[PDB]
Ligand binder design. Sequence first.
Ligand SMILES: *[C@@H]1O[C@H](CO)[C@@H](O[C@@H]2O[C@H](CO)[C@@H](O[C@@H]3O[C@H](CO[C@H]4O[C@H](CO)[C@@H](O)[C@H](O)[C@@H]4O)[C@@H](O)[C@H](O[C@H]4O[C@H](CO)[C@@H](O)[C@H](O)[C@@H]4O)[C@@H]3O)[C@H](O)[C@H]2NC(C)=O)[C@H](O)[C@H]1NC(C)=O
Ligand SMILES: *[C@@H]1O[C@H](CO)[C@@H](O[C@@H]2O[C@H](CO)[C@@H](O[C@@H]3O[C@H](CO[C@H]4O[C@H](CO)[C@@H](O)[C@H](O)[C@@H]4O)[C@@H](O)[C@H](O[C@H]4O[C@H](CO)[C@@H](O)[C@H](O)[C@@H]4O)[C@@H]3O)[C@H](O)[C@H]2NC(C)=O)[C@H](O)[C@H]1NC(C)=O
Ligand SMILES: *[C@@H]1O[C@H](CO)[C@@H](O[C@@H]2O[C@H](CO)[C@@H](O)[C@H](O)[C@H]2NC(C)=O)[C@H](O)[C@H]1NC(C)=O
Ligand SMILES: *[C@@H]1O[C@H](CO)[C@@H](O[C@@H]2O[C@H](CO)[C@@H](O)[C@H](O)[C@H]2NC(C)=O)[C@H](O)[C@H]1NC(C)=O
Ligand SMILES: *[C@@H]1O[C@H](CO)[C@@H](O[C@@H]2O[C@H](CO)[C@@H](O)[C@H](O)[C@H]2NC(C)=O)[C@H](O)[C@H]1NC(C)=O
Lengths: 216, 108, 226, 213
Amino acid sequence: GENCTLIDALLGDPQCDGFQNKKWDLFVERSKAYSNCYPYDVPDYASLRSLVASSGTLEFNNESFNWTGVTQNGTSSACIRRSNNSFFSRLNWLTHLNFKYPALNVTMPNNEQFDKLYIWGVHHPGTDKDQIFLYAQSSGRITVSTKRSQQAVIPNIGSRPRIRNIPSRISIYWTIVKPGDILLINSTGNLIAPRGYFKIRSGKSSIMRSDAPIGK
Amino acid sequence: PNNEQFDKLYIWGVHHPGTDKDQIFLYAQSSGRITVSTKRSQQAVIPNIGSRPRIRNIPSRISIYWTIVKPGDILLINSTGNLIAPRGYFKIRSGKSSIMRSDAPIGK
Amino acid sequence: EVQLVESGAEVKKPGSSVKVSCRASGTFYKYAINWVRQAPGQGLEWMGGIIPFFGTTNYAQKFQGRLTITADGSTNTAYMQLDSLRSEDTAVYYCAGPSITESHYCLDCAAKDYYYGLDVWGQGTTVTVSSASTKGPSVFPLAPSGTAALGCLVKDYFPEPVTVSWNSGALTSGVHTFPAVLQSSGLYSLSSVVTVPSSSLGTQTYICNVNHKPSNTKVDKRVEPK
Amino acid sequence: QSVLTQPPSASGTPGQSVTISCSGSRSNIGGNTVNWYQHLPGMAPKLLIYSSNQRSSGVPDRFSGSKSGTSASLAISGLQSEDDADYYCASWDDSLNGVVFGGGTKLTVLGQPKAAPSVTLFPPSSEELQANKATLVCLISDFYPGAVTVAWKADSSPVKAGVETTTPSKQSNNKYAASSYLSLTPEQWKSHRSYSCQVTHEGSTVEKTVAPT
Ligand SMILES: *[C@@H]1O[C@H](CO)[C@@H](O[C@@H]2O[C@H](CO)[C@@H](O[C@@H]3O[C@H](CO[C@H]4O[C@H](CO)[C@@H](O)[C@H](O)[C@@H]4O)[C@@H](O)[C@H](O[C@H]4O[C@H](CO)[C@@H](O)[C@H](O)[C@@H]4O)[C@@H]3O)[C@H](O)[C@H]2NC(C)=O)[C@H](O)[C@H]1NC(C)=O
Ligand SMILES: *[C@@H]1O[C@H](CO)[C@@H](O[C@@H]2O[C@H](CO)[C@@H](O[C@@H]3O[C@H](CO[C@H]4O[C@H](CO)[C@@H](O)[C@H](O)[C@@H]4O)[C@@H](O)[C@H](O[C@H]4O[C@H](CO)[C@@H](O)[C@H](O)[C@@H]4O)[C@@H]3O)[C@H](O)[C@H]2NC(C)=O)[C@H](O)[C@H]1NC(C)=O
Ligand SMILES: *[C@@H]1O[C@H](CO)[C@@H](O[C@@H]2O[C@H](CO)[C@@H](O)[C@H](O)[C@H]2NC(C)=O)[C@H](O)[C@H]1NC(C)=O
Ligand SMILES: *[C@@H]1O[C@H](CO)[C@@H](O[C@@H]2O[C@H](CO)[C@@H](O)[C@H](O)[C@H]2NC(C)=O)[C@H](O)[C@H]1NC(C)=O
Ligand SMILES: *[C@@H]1O[C@H](CO)[C@@H](O[C@@H]2O[C@H](CO)[C@@H](O)[C@H](O)[C@H]2NC(C)=O)[C@H](O)[C@H]1NC(C)=O
C-alpha cells in the first residue's frame, strides 16, 4: 500500500492512482500512509475496509449515470492531481448548474450476474455560504435505496477543525446491489456521486498492518 | 486543544426538554443543535422535544455522549442550544482495571 | 461563446458616481469577470475583478474604497461603480472574461485560480468626468498662411459629437477634420482644415459648417485671408 | 512604473521578426502564467497568448509567447502591416492579490517608409483676441509611426503651461494625425516676437512659427 490506506486506494486519492483495478491476496498497509485529498470520514470504516480486503479486488467498471440538471465533477485545492485541482477518481462532486440543483432521481439497474459495490458520499460544507454556493439551496438531502435497503443522510453544515486547511467534510457510505435489484439515488444536494461500481468477489484475500519491507 | 501528552476523555450531553415551552424558555429558540468534532471524528445531535414517562417527576431527558481527543488534536463544540457542557476532561489510562457487579461485603 | 454588451457612454461631474452595466448573452458565472480601463494616452489599467460563482471581489489598491463591482447571476449582468470621480477617471471602460470551461470545476479555491486570460470582451463604455454641462461651440476662422492651409477652430463644446462640412458638403477634396482634444476645462475642441491651391485664395469662397447635435447648435463661418 | 516593465517601442519591416520582452518579479511572472494582449485603436484588446506559451483560438503561429524565471516574451515573425499595435503583458501578482499589466510596447510594422509629419500652425484669429482669449493651433498630419511629442516656445523660451495635446489617430490614408493647442492671454501673445510649435517624431524635430505681425 505504501503511502495509501485501502480506503484511500478505493476512493482514488491521486497519489493512489497506480492502484486502480489491481488485485491482491494480501494488501499491506504501512503506518506511514496518509491521505492527501479532501478530508473524509467513513462510518464503520473498519467494516468497509474489511469487506474490501476480503473481496481482494479494486476492479472498477464505470457507468453512465444521468446527471442531467447539475454540474458534475466538482474539485478542491486540498486534492491535487498532476499539480492541478482535482477530486477522488471514483467519485463525482455534483454542484448547481445555472443556479439550480434539481432534485435528482437517478436509477442504475444491476442487470449483471454479479453483485456491484457502490461507493458514494455526502458533503458537509463548512458554512451556509458554502451551502448556497455549492448547491444553490439551504439544505441538501440524499436517499440511496435498493429493493432491499435504504440509506438516508442529512448534511451537517458547520466548521470542523481544519484538515489541510479544510473545515468541511465528506461522509462515505457504501451500497451493494444484487443482480435483479436496482440502485436508486434521490438527491436535492450534497451528493458526492459514484462514477460506477466496484466488482466484489469472494476468496482468500485479507489485509495486514505491517512496516516490514517486501522481499523477493 | 489537547496540548498535553496524554489522551483526554470528554463527557457531554444534550438536553431534550419535555415541551416547546421549555425549549423557548431555556435556549431562547425553538430548535437547538449540537455538533462536537475533532480532527478525526464528528458527532452531531438534534434535541428531541416531547414528553417522556416522568422520572422523579421529570418528563424531560438528557442524553450522554463522550469524545476522546488525541494529542495534537482539538475539541470543537458548535451549538445553537440544548448543550450540556463538560467542565473539563477525564484522564484516560490503560492497565489491569475492571468492573464487577456484586453484592458481596468488603472484608479486611 | 457568450457575447458581452455594455451600457452606453456616460458623463459625470467631479465628485459624483457612475455605474456601468455588462450584460452577457448567457450564464457566465464560474470565472472571474474583470474590469480594465484605458485613459487617453495611458496604458491598459486593471481595476479589479469578481469571481461571480463566489461573489468574491479583488480590487486594485488605487481604487479601493471607491470602486464596487457587483454580479447579479439572475440577469447575467455585471456592473462597475466608481465613486468620487476625478479627471483621471476619464477612460474607456471594458468588462471582460474567459471562455474557459473545465471537466472539473474547483469548489473551495484561492481567488487567483479563477482568473484567466481574457478572450471575451465587451464593446467598451466611454465615461467622461467633467464639470462642464452641455455647451455649444465657439467657432473661429483659421486664416490661410505651392499650396496653403486654412480652417476652422471649434472651441469649447461639450459633449461629442460635432460634425463639420465645407461649402455645405460641396467642398470635399483636401479636407481633413481632426479628432477633438479633451481640454483641462472638461470641454472638447477640434479643427477642420482644407488644403487648397494658393492661387485660388483671391476669388474662391470658403465657409465651414459646424454642427453640434447635443447642444443643437450650428455655426457657419466665412474664412478669409487676414 | 508599472509592475511589469516593457520597452515603450519595437519595430521591424514586412516579413522581418521582432521580440518584445516583459520583466516582472518573483511575486508575479516567477509564479504565475503570462497573458499577452494586442490593442488596436478604437476596439477592445484581443488575447493572443495565455498560459505563457499557448496561442488563443484563431491566432496564427507567427505570434508566440514564452516565459522563464521572472521574465516573459512575445515574438512576432513574418511581419505584416496589421500587426502594428500596442502589446500588453499581464499576469496575477501574489503580493498585490490582483492582476498587473506591463506598460505596453508600441510595435511598428514599417509597411510604408517612415514618414515625417506635415505640420500646420495657426495664430489666434482676430475674433478670439477680441473675446479676450488666444489659442495657437498646431496641426500635425501624414506621419508614421503614430507617435509624436510637442513642445511650445514663446520666442526661444519653452512654454509648458496651457498646453493640450491629443493622442495620435489613424487617418484615412493609414498614416497618423494629431492636434495641439496653446492657450494664452492676448497680453502674452502680442508681447513676444513669435511663438513656435515643435513636433518631434522618431527623434527628429521640426517646428512651425507664428508672429503677431
Ligand atoms: C469556529 O472556531 C474555529 C476556531 O477558532 C474557527 O476556525 C478558524 O477558521 C479560520 C478561518 O479560515 C482559520 O483562519 C486561517 O488560519 C490559517 C492559520 O494557519 C497558519 O498556521 C498554520 C500552522 O502553522 C500554517 O500551516 C499556515 O500556513 C498558517 O501560517 C491562515 O493560514 C489563514 O490565512 C489565510 O486565509 C485568509 C482568509 O481567511 C487570508 O486573508 C490570508 O491571506 C491567508 O490566505 C486563515 O486565516 C483559523 O485557522 C481557524 N482557527 C483555529 C484556531 O483553528 C472557525 O472559523 C469557527 N467556525 C465557525 C462556523 O465560525
Ligand atoms: C403525555 O401523556 C402523559 C400521561 O398522561 C402526560 O404526563 C402527565 O403530566 C402531567 C402534567 O405534568 C402530570 O400531572 C401531575 O400529576 C402529579 C401526580 O403525581 C403523583 O405521583 C405519585 C403516584 O401517586 C405520587 O406519590 C406523587 O406524590 C404525585 O402526587 C400531580 O401531583 C401534579 O399536580 C401538581 O402540579 C399541578 C400543575 O401542573 C398543580 O396544579 C398541583 O397543585 C400540583 O402542584 C400534576 O397533576 C401527570 O402525572 C402525568 N401523567 C402521568 C400518568 O404520568 C404528559 O404530559 C403528556 N405529554 C404531552 C407532551 O402531552
Ligand atoms: C510517500 O510520501 C512520503 C511523504 O511525502 C514521501 O517521502 C518523501 O520522499 C522524498 C523523496 O525521497 C523526499 O525528498 C522527501 O523528503 C520525503 N517527504 C517527507 C515528508 O518525508 C515518499 O516518497 C512517498 N513514498 C512512496 C514510495 O511513494
Ligand atoms: C467528469 O469527469 C470525468 C473524469 O475525468 C470525465 O470522464 C472522462 O470522460 C471522457 C469522455 O468519455 C473519457 O474519455 C475519459 O476516459 C474519462 N476520464 C476519466 C478519468 O474517467 C467525464 O466526462 C466528466 N463528466 C462529464 C459528463 O462531463
Ligand atoms: C427526490 O427527488 C424528487 C424528484 O426530483 C424530488 O421531488 C421534487 O421536490 C421538490 C421540492 O418540493 C419539488 O419542487 C419538485 O417539483 C420535485 N421534483 C420533481 C421532478 O418532481 C424530491 O423532493 C426528492 N426527495 C428528497 C428527499 O430529496
